A = this chain, B = another copy of it.
């Protein structure tokens, strides 16, 4: 592990991947809100939470397996064994939110925002931005998914409701 690795990771990610990476690490960078991905990785390494396994898990969650192979010289099974061995840096709640967001198009996110405006008081935002807003209002949480579940059912997205139910049953 070095700083060249952090630089390569920062320069080899696109905008959506960076936005997702910032969202997944929201539970480890709570006191500080990192402005960009490089500063987030610098803070994680400063706090000792950015080892080789931690960065491998991060790249695994953003599904950048090419960077896992090229930069960290790891395959899928290696990162899976690391996740089975040690406690995770990113909780299953963040992974579930990111997965549901990845399976939602602009129209679905727009319709979902339209339903949420009853429970919460202006640009085209992604699903993760909506999750962040709901978190800022204590409307969604790992132990509080009934509202998001109902809204996903109401937009005829039963598969994501089943993802939420699977998460609820795994705990």
Contact = CB atoms under 8 A, between A and B. Distances in A.
A110 B138 CA distance: 32
Please tell me how many copies of the chain the complex holds. Answer: 4
Interface string A1-31: 0111011100111100000000000000011
B118 A7 contact: no
Contact of A3 (B65, B76, B117): B117
Given A66-B136, A136-B63, A137-B63, A30 B7 contact: no
Q: Which of A12, A38, A102 has the most CB of B within 10 A?
A: A12
Interface of A: 2-4, 6-8, 11-14, 30-33, 38, 42, 63-66, 69-70, 75-76, 99, 102-103, 105-106, 111, 114-115, 117-118, 121-122, 135-138, 154-155
